[PDB]
Amino acid sequence: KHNMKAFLDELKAENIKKFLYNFTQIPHLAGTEQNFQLAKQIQSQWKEFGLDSVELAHYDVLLSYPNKTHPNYISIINEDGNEIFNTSLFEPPPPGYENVSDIVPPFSAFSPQGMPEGDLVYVNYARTEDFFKLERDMKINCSGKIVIARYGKVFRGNKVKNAQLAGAKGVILYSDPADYFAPGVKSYPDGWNLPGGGVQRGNILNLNGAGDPLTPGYPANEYAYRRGIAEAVGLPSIPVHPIGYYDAQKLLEKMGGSAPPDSSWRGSLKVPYNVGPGFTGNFSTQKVKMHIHSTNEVTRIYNVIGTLRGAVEPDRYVILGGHRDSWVFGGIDPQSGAAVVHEIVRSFGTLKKEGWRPRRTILFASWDAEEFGLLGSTEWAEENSRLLQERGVAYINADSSIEGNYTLRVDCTPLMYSLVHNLTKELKSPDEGFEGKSLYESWTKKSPSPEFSGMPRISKLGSGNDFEVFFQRLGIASGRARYTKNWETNKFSGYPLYHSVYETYELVEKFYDPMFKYHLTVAQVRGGMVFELANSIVLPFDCRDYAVVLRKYADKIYSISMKHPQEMKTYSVSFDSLFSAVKNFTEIASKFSERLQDFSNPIVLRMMNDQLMFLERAFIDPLGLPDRPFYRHVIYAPSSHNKYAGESFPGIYDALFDIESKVDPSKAWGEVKRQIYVAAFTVQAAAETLSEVA
Amino acid sequence: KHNMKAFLDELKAENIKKFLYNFTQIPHLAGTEQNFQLAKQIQSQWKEFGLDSVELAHYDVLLSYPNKTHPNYISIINEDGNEIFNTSLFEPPPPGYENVSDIVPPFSAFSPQGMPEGDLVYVNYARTEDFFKLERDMKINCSGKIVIARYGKVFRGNKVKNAQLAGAKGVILYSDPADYFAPGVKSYPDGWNLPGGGVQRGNILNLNGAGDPLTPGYPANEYAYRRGIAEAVGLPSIPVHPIGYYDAQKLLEKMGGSAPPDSSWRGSLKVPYNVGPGFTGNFSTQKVKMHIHSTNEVTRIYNVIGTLRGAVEPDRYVILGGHRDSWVFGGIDPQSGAAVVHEIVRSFGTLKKEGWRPRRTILFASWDAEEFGLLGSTEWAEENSRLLQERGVAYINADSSIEGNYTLRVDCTPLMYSLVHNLTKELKSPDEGFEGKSLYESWTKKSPSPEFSGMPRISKLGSGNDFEVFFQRLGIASGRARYTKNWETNKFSGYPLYHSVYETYELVEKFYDPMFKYHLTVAQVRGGMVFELANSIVLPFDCRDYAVVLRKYADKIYSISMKHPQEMKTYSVSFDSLFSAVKNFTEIASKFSERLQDFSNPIVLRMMNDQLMFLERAFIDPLGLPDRPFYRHVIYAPSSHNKYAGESFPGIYDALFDIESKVDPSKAWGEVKRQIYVAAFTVQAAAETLSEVA
Ligand SMILES: *[C@@H]1O[C@H](CO)[C@@H](O[C@@H]2O[C@H](CO)[C@@H](O[C@@H]3O[C@H](CO)[C@@H](O)[C@H](O[C@H]4O[C@H](CO)[C@@H](O)[C@H](O)[C@@H]4O)[C@@H]3O)[C@H](O)[C@H]2NC(C)=O)[C@H](O)[C@H]1NC(C)=O
Ligand SMILES: *[C@@H]1O[C@H](CO)[C@@H](O[C@@H]2O[C@H](CO)[C@@H](O[C@@H]3O[C@H](CO)[C@@H](O)[C@H](O[C@H]4O[C@H](CO)[C@@H](O)[C@H](O)[C@@H]4O)[C@@H]3O)[C@H](O)[C@H]2NC(C)=O)[C@H](O)[C@H]1NC(C)=O
Ligand SMILES: *[C@@H]1O[C@H](CO)[C@@H](O[C@@H]2O[C@H](CO)[C@@H](O)[C@H](O)[C@H]2NC(C)=O)[C@H](O)[C@H]1NC(C)=O
Ligand SMILES: *[C@@H]1O[C@H](CO)[C@@H](O[C@@H]2O[C@H](CO)[C@@H](O)[C@H](O)[C@H]2NC(C)=O)[C@H](O)[C@H]1NC(C)=O
Ligand SMILES: *[C@@H]1O[C@H](CO)[C@@H](O[C@@H]2O[C@H](CO)[C@@H](O)[C@H](O)[C@H]2NC(C)=O)[C@H](O)[C@H]1NC(C)=O
Ligand SMILES: *[C@@H]1O[C@H](CO)[C@@H](O[C@@H]2O[C@H](CO)[C@@H](O)[C@H](O)[C@H]2NC(C)=O)[C@H](O)[C@H]1NC(C)=O
Ligand SMILES: *[C@@H]1O[C@H](CO)[C@@H](O[C@@H]2O[C@H](CO)[C@@H](O)[C@H](O)[C@H]2NC(C)=O)[C@H](O)[C@H]1NC(C)=O
Ligand SMILES: *[C@@H]1O[C@H](CO)[C@@H](O[C@@H]2O[C@H](CO)[C@@H](O)[C@H](O)[C@H]2NC(C)=O)[C@H](O)[C@H]1NC(C)=O
Ligand SMILES: O=C(N[C@@H](CCCCNC(=O)c1ccc(I)cc1)C(=O)O)NC1(C(=O)O)CC1
Ligand SMILES: O=C(N[C@@H](CCCCNC(=O)c1ccc(I)cc1)C(=O)O)NC1(C(=O)O)CC1
Ligand SMILES: *[C@@H]1O[C@H](CO)[C@@H](O)[C@H](O)[C@H]1NC(C)=O
Ligand SMILES: *[C@@H]1O[C@H](CO)[C@@H](O)[C@H](O)[C@H]1NC(C)=O
Ligand SMILES: *[C@@H]1O[C@H](CO)[C@@H](O)[C@H](O)[C@H]1NC(C)=O
Ligand SMILES: *[C@@H]1O[C@H](CO)[C@@H](O)[C@H](O)[C@H]1NC(C)=O
Ligand SMILES: *[C@@H]1O[C@H](CO)[C@@H](O)[C@H](O)[C@H]1NC(C)=O
Ligand SMILES: *[C@@H]1O[C@H](CO)[C@@H](O)[C@H](O)[C@H]1NC(C)=O
Ligand SMILES: [Ca+2]
Ligand SMILES: [Ca+2]
Ligand SMILES: [Cl-]
Ligand SMILES: [Cl-]
Ligand SMILES: [Zn+2]
Ligand SMILES: [Zn+2]
Ligand SMILES: [Zn+2]
Ligand SMILES: [Zn+2]
């Protein structure tokens, strides 16, 4: 038989291991020849595996690279102008790869050029609340200073945006051992911790979903009109560079001015974590000088797009996509995900060769330039938006399959909650102590839902990965799943070797997943979801699960507003419309579910499948969110303070944020009321798509 | 049998006559009690006629009305400040209606209040080119003057926008006998010409598709957040008032300053048509003073929405809609259209009572507040946009069925050209001299296509009626058809009694259509289109007809650009991408048509019907046109100089318009190139929706 069990049994840990090794022997940086060769290899193999069509879709996008003959570095400079300390020009390469060339040195992609020189101020994680504390409570002025911030907690682009609006003339990012060195584990190559010379790469854009900075709204094809660099979307205005904790120690150790305000501002280095500005007495004449010479350049990128045509609904698309480009070797990010995708394609192709096809079309994607701002997935979605709008059932992301080995982590639309619960109950747990138990049981034990006893945690989607365009711009139901660590406070920080040269095959095989059993479990979860989405007669979405979360989100936003009861009285700020809409959605969803359970008629089926598919689409406002036209989903958007985190009712949340500091409270509360109307209207409109059609 | 012939034979001229009489005995001004009572009557009757559901959808929108106890008028005022001449406070009412009350006096809806006083300048039709002639050639400065313009040629809102940007402090609109008095015909009540006391009402908004000025993007429902009046969309900033030619004569006869520049500036009154500014010698101290006291107020409006549920595809909607609100009696506009819609509903209901249902759902709409800026249709479409987006097959408008008795006039998407040709070949011509001949034959003889021998003219859609939101914002295939006059130069001016108190039942029955045969023909065309759209197994759209017009439109925009060959060389302005896209669209459309002709499989059918339905949708850019976010169709938009006229490739057209006067030609030509890319991309994207789906 050709059923989900046949699909799942065909997946093999040893194949995923073979593929990971094959994908991680040389760097695959976006825009380079190596990454083009890998794209060509994957295209050839996906054809061999049995896909109906496999094409490269290429775009010419803005990328960023250091200048090979003019290296980026930071100095402490004396009053004569002698550079008495320099940060490293590269990470010491891992054992056996000290002869690989084309390892890109650590840099912050898209930093402008400059050589700013100034006094340091330490801004903790450079979060919105850290800047509030500095400026409002400590009365420390960041204007004209170089800010030094530790990585962690929030997306680095948000740190740089925050520093820029504080008036900083430069940003130094570093990895503190508090966030990137787990106690009791050894540094690479003898354990999975970050060495003092390790550095986290990463882009510092604030694109807000735009894709290629030069072509917002339209694909960067051969005849594209490009904005000038001055009008480009999302580029930082001040230079930025990342360093490791050996170099950070040298910069922080001389810091003077104010004591840190409390212990949450102290990392693990042997320094005072003084906030500054500037150095203590004897060194008060020394300054810090950045030297940044990276260049932005329009460069070709290549997505691999594979098609497995549906037997019954070939005009309905289930998409499994993840990126292929890496900072260096990509041992976890992304090749641990890409190796899983390759084995999933191989398994679907095996069934295809035996005569089977899925009910709906499955599209497989190997995205390029994800590391430079989700460019490959976004450009392809801009090119194909009309097809995706009208035909896209679901998108399942597939970046890193593991970031730890403790338990499952899932983020998805509420429409997939029931699907994920049902699938994990049929999968075997790979965890020690749970042999013979289901993945649902181990996951629920290790990661309990905060609200429901006997259910696991599933988080909201935000951004920071290639599902963003599909879910936040186009309103296609999306999900993702991976194996994760225990470390709750580190959930947005990355694992210790994230975006460093030390993310290698050896890291994964020695320290994360030697038997590839966690990889296999994740291939079963991602592959299983795609199989059910592409083959179930009725789409496996439960609208009642959206009704449940919409009430939670409404209660939550109401509670935030109710921190200001006098203003709510004065400006007559009522949430009645929004609760009414959510109540209506609950009632209509309940009636729709009854009809779905109670209807031989393929028109009623497909009419009902169309109602299910277009339900996520109904949450899209074609006018977008305020000043963020490419974030259009009214229930979910990436947090304005942390692109990695999902925020619920983001239009209302942002209207309420820091509202007590607004100078015209009448205008500010007016805008809260406007967002309440938009949200109530959209919830009601979405509910009405589930009513009887005529 | 229940086929189109059964539907068509059930339509009766005498019923349309009965209904027109019933709809025109009292005024039905938007927002008034009379118009609410008519809405209730129509709802009751549509239920009686056999519709499955008939509901009122109400909204609270900004309307505008004169102040009943402080009338609007214009004066000539002497240097003492004595008002020596006053324009009329009302039109002499027609015979037998001199005792109807609640006849709203002539006014320009949405004019602000004011009493500006100044010198007159005569600006012909106040078109963009008339203002260019005045300002650039004649060097006449409109700043601080009152402009007097004749109605005709372009939408009056565009006249007022043009006057405002010229710096006018007021606008007087009048009907010149050259445009509104056909030679050799008598004035009402003895013929269909405009009397000297007749006045054309009408709104002067520039909404650009927004709908209710206070709630752009969202329906004006009970919890809607409204903009303040200062931020309202589309309101004029200077007072405006319309007058008849007896009053115009008194204002124009004293005009001095420059002679008219040529004969195209002279109307038919016994005046010099001097441009001004100001009056001749002896009267040079007299001024003109406007007195405008109208008020804008949020007022409830009611649409009637009737549903006839489809037997096989109830989730696919064919919409027949037209408005019900009128300036006064609405004898032609809109009741001649509404009476036809009522008889169409009656005929479909008769077949329904015999057990028949259409394949797809048919929705019938009686829109309110069309006269105040398409408010009723736009608010309902904003409320229902997700349903319409995903389920709307076509929209057929039904305002005035007659504006003359010479021949048919059709404007529609190219997707309906073949449908209209085929239907008119099966209908009998009602014209004298064509008895026993088809409507196609009479229409083609009287209104030949400019490009094709043996085919009739069909025009583009622009705006100025309730199809605008469906076609220009949502991308639903739309069409309209009516009987028209011979008068080519008057095609945007209206018939003589347009928007005057003299548009009565007697006007239609005595002078336009005494046997209601032209009304019946139009009911057969509109009703026939709706029947075919709702019942044909394959949607009756021919994508190859779009490919033909896209080439014409590309040749046309290329030719406009080629008036500037040196700039095209300098800035490398190439149309190659756009021609390539159109060539591709032609090829793919041809292959799609072959497959459509060559496929028992309802999935392939409905997949193919979905490709046909979503083809118009593919021309929508979700980013809208520049500064016009609610005009989203890339091929068609209402002309920026005349809302009534359709413009093709409007983004490129507007980028090229008057480009030689732009101060930064590099920037201006950059923007032309950007619009060429957007258009080429969208044409290719639309073509790709017709490719094989996987
Ligand atoms: C959730 O679904 C329910 C439907 O089950 C839906 O209820 C609707 O609520 C609206 C607004 O609350 C009702 O609107 C009323 O409609 C009547 C005519 O039917 C009008 O006469 C009412 O207007 C008068 O009263 C107003 C309120 O005080 C005044 O402001 C106004 O000036 C008038 O005097 C009023 O518009 C509507 O009838 C119901 N529909 C029903 C019960 O079927 C509700 O709106 C949905 N929630 C959301 C957020 O959409
Ligand atoms: C109409 O449909 C046709 C398809 O039948 C489609 O043709 C496509 O045109 C594009 C752009 O013209 C082609 O793009 C080329 O792709 C190859 C790889 O396949 C690249 O190597 C090419 O890049 C080189 O050459 C460029 C042009 O001089 C340089 O700018 C560049 O730096 C490289 O050196 C180039 O990108 C594409 O292959 C075809 N596809 C085909 C033939 O199947 C056409 O684009 C459609 N028209 C529109 C408006 O969409
Ligand atoms: C990764 O695996 C691929 C596929 O087996 C290897 O590419 C093949 O290399 C062999 C031997 O040189 C050639 O004969 C084939 O043409 C290649 N097949 C392709 C590209 O589809 C590749 O060499 C392996 N890479 C590494 C780094 O081990
Ligand atoms: C840090 O790096 C800088 C740049 O290479 C070093 O300063 C240079 O030293 C060379 C050789 O002495 C001089 O010729 C250059 O003029 C210097 N350049 C600048 C910009 O100062 C510096 O020696 C290094 N500092 C340390 C402590 O190693
Ligand atoms: C997850 O599994 C549950 C339990 O099997 C499914 O719920 C059942 O679905 C069938 C078919 O509609 C019903 O007859 C049962 O009453 C349901 N049981 C319940 C609600 O407890 C549920 O549909 C599955 N979710 C999916 C497939 O998304
Ligand atoms: C227009 O026609 C309607 C429908 O026949 C008339 O309304 C009816 O009036 C009669 C006699 O007063 C009542 O018994 C019915 O209740 C009405 N039916 C409705 C409203 O559905 C209406 O009076 C006619 N109007 C004019 C101006 O002739
Ligand atoms: C035009 O209308 C105005 C306003 O009604 C007339 O002027 C008024 O005349 C009355 C009676 O003589 C005076 O009490 C008012 O003070 C006048 N008002 C203003 C604003 O001037 C005027 O007589 C009319 N002109 C003509 C020629 O009929
Ligand atoms: C208009 O009528 C023409 C002529 O009947 C239709 O074109 C024919 O359609 C059938 C069915 O696909 C074909 O077998 C014939 O070859 C067509 N004749 C032609 C192209 O000359 C056309 O489909 C009708 N248009 C509609 C219904 O939109
Ligand atoms: O590196 C990126 N993404 C990694 C970032 C990991 C760090 C934060 N992790 C999460 O937000 C996360 C949330 C849910 C799941 I299931 C997994 C990871 C990823 O999404 O795997 N994205 C970019 C980035 O520079 O941040 C390259 C764009
Ligand atoms: O009055 C309006 N519409 C009439 C306007 C008639 C004058 C210009 N005529 C056309 O643009 C026209 C084009 C195609 C067809 I088929 C019929 C008329 C109508 O569309 O019947 N619309 C408004 C207006 O004030 O202009 C009320 C909004
Ligand atoms: C990189 O630096 C070198 C050496 O100083 C310089 O010649 C070249 O212009 C730079 N390359 C760039 C900016 O791409
Ligand atoms: C910070 O410093 C600059 C001057 O160096 C000044 O313009 C700015 O207003 C200061 N900001 C605050 C909040 O003190
Ligand atoms: C894998 O799990 C084991 C067992 O608890 C643990 O000791 C090891 O540190 C884990 N690896 C990682 C990277 O968390
Ligand atoms: C209309 O004019 C009257 C009489 O001068 C005035 O009292 C009233 O305020 C006005 N009505 C309005 C502005 O709605
Ligand atoms: C028209 O008149 C006003 C002054 O009354 C002046 O400001 C404006 O610039 C003039 N415009 C032209 C084009 O002469
Ligand atoms: C109706 O047609 C007749 C015959 O040509 C013509 O004399 C009459 O003026 C027409 N009515 C209108 C309003 O055009
Ligand atoms: Ca782009
Ligand atoms: Ca609105
Ligand atoms: Cl992922
Ligand atoms: Cl019409
Ligand atoms: Zn990644
Ligand atoms: Zn990454
Ligand atoms: Zn009308
Ligand atoms: Zn009208």
Side-chain angles (χ1 to χ4, degrees), chain A residues 131-316:
Chain A
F131 278 101
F132 281 166
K133 179 92 81 203
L134 260 180
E135 300 177 297
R136 299 171 173 193
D137 302 328
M138 296 178 88
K139 275 77 157 72
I140 281 149
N141 187 5
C142 289
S143 180
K145 313 300 177 201
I146 297 172
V147 295
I148 180 157
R150 49 175 174 162
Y151 269 130
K153 307 294 191 198
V154 308
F155 174 61
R156 66 188 84 70
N158 289 101
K159 305 177 190 272
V160 171
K161 175 174 173 283
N162 296 345
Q164 209 175 283
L165 301 183
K169 67 176 154 181
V171 182
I172 299 164
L173 297 169
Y174 81 100
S175 301
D176 198 289
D179 310 283
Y180 295 98
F181 194 91
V185 6
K186 285 156 177 152
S187 291
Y188 199 80
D190 301 314
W192 45 271
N193 266 341
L194 187 67
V199 185
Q200 179 192 139
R201 290 157 188 76
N203 85 71
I204 53 171
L205 292 172
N206 282 273
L207 288 175
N208 293 325
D212 168 44
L214 303 189
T215 58
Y218 308 93
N221 61 27
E222 280 271 4
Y223 54 93
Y225 189 73
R226 290 184 170 81
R227 292 185 172 195
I229 209 67
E231 284 77 32
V233 177
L235 311 176
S237 70
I238 55 177
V240 184
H241 193 63
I243 63 177
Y245 57 87
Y246 288 157
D247 286 341
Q249 168 110 209
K250 303 294 294 208
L251 302 177
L252 295 168
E253 65 184 1
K254 288 166 164 181
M255 291 205 52
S258 301
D262 65 61
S263 77
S264 71
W265 276 60
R266 292 195 48 88
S268 294
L269 302 171
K270 299 297 133 173
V271 298
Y273 290 93
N274 285 337
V275 168
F279 294 144
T280 55
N282 294 276
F283 307 108
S284 69
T285 66
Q286 301 175 350
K287 309 273 152 139
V288 171
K289 185 180 186 166
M290 304 182 69
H291 306 83
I292 307 306
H293 309 107
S294 300
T295 61
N296 294 332
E297 49 215 55
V298 175
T299 305
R300 184 157 285 186
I301 59 165
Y302 297 90
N303 301 323
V304 189
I305 310 296
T307 299
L308 183 52
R309 177 176 26 92
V312 179
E313 306 191 77
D315 74 337
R316 294 279 175 274

Side-chain angles (χ1 to χ4, degrees), chain A residues 74-148:
Chain A
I74 294 158
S75 294
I76 293 164
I77 206 162
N78 64 27
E79 53 189 12
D80 296 337
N82 311 334
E83 305 188 330
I84 63 171
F85 163 78
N86 292 329
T87 62
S88 181
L89 303 186
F90 61 90
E91 300 171 281
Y97 296 88
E98 315 94 336
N99 196 67
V100 182
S101 58
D102 262 64
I103 290 174
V104 73
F107 74 117
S108 298
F110 303 99
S111 172
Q113 305 192 351
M115 301 185 204
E117 166 203 321
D119 299 317
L120 219 36
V121 168
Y122 168 65
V123 302
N124 198 27
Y125 297 106
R127 294 167 303 181
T128 299
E129 58 265 41
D130 300 318
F131 278 101
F132 281 166
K133 179 92 81 203
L134 260 180
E135 300 177 297
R136 299 171 173 193
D137 302 328
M138 296 178 88
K139 275 77 157 72
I140 281 149
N141 187 5
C142 289
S143 180
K145 313 300 177 201
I146 297 172
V147 295
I148 180 157

Side-chain angles (χ1 to χ4, degrees), chain B residues 238-509:
Chain B
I238 55 177
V240 184
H241 193 63
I243 63 177
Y245 57 87
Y246 288 157
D247 286 341
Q249 168 110 209
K250 303 294 294 208
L251 302 177
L252 295 168
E253 65 184 1
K254 288 166 164 181
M255 291 205 52
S258 301
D262 65 61
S263 77
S264 71
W265 276 60
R266 292 195 48 88
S268 294
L269 302 171
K270 299 297 133 173
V271 298
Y273 290 93
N274 285 337
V275 168
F279 294 144
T280 55
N282 294 276
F283 307 108
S284 69
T285 66
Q286 301 175 350
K287 309 273 152 139
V288 171
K289 185 180 186 166
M290 304 182 69
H291 306 83
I292 307 306
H293 309 107
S294 300
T295 61
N296 294 332
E297 49 215 55
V298 175
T299 305
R300 184 157 285 186
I301 59 165
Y302 297 90
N303 301 323
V304 189
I305 310 296
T307 299
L308 183 52
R309 177 176 26 92
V312 179
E313 306 191 77
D315 74 337
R316 294 279 175 274
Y317 303 148
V318 174
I319 309 172
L320 173 61
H323 74 104
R324 179 185 70 258
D325 64 296
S326 62
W327 284 117
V328 196
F329 304 107
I332 290 177
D333 179 11
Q335 308 307 347
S336 72
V340 153
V341 173
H342 214 52
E343 176 69 349
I344 290 166
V345 174
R346 196 197 61 81
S347 180
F348 276 116
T350 303
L351 308 175
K352 193 206 123 173
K353 290 169 181 196
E354 286 157 17
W356 168 92
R357 281 184 178 282
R359 178 186 175 86
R360 300 185 179 80
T361 288
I362 302 171
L363 304 173
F364 298 95
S366 175
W367 302 128
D368 202 354
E370 183 273 357
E371 299 293 10
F372 290 81
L374 318 180
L375 307 185
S377 57
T378 303
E379 293 309 301
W380 184 82
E382 288 183 327
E383 188 154 71
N384 294 293
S385 63
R386 291 148 182 82
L387 306 184
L388 293 170
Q389 157 82 28
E390 306 311 355
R391 300 179 193 170
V393 169
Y395 178 88
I396 298 302
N397 205 50
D399 194 350
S400 312
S401 294
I402 48 148
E403 59 184 20
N405 65 15
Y406 182 62
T407 196
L408 197 69
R409 178 177 186 180
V410 178
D411 295 9
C412 68
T413 171
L415 288 179
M416 288 175 197
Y417 285 171
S418 293
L419 165 58
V420 171
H421 296 158
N422 287 2
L423 175 61
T424 61
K425 293 184 194 169
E426 299 303 331
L427 300 179
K428 296 209 270 291
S429 172
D431 297 1
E432 271 88 17
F434 292 87
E435 27 288 291
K437 306 303 171 56
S438 77
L439 176 60
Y440 182 93
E441 172 166 328
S442 64
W443 176 34
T444 294
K445 192 60 156 49
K446 292 176 169 184
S447 195
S449 162
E451 32 266 18
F452 302 108
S453 194
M455 316 223 305
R457 176 189 294 277
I458 301 180
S459 297
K460 304 192 282 287
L461 294 165
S463 183
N465 222 300
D466 284 310
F467 64 84
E468 187 207 63
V469 65
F470 299 95
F471 188 61
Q472 304 295 0
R473 193 197 294 201
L474 300 178
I476 297 163
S478 293
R480 62 199 301 211
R482 71 175 50 174
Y483 247 68
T484 193
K485 77 276 183 107
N486 200 331
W487 213 341
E488 201 72 13
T489 47
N490 256 33
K491 74 182 196 283
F492 297 122
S493 303
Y495 45 94
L497 295 171
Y498 170 64
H499 285 185
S500 75
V501 70
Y502 304 114
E503 278 201 49
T504 56
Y505 171 79
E506 290 73 36
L507 174 59
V508 174
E509 191 270 332

Side-chain angles (χ1 to χ4, degrees), chain A residues 22 25 41 44-45 48:
Chain A
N22 184 265
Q25 296 312 292
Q41 176 193 320
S44 184
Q45 291 189 298
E48 293 164 28

Side-chain angles (χ1 to χ4, degrees), chain B residues 212 215-216 218-220 379 382:
Chain B
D212 168 44
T215 58
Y218 308 93
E379 293 309 301
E382 288 183 327

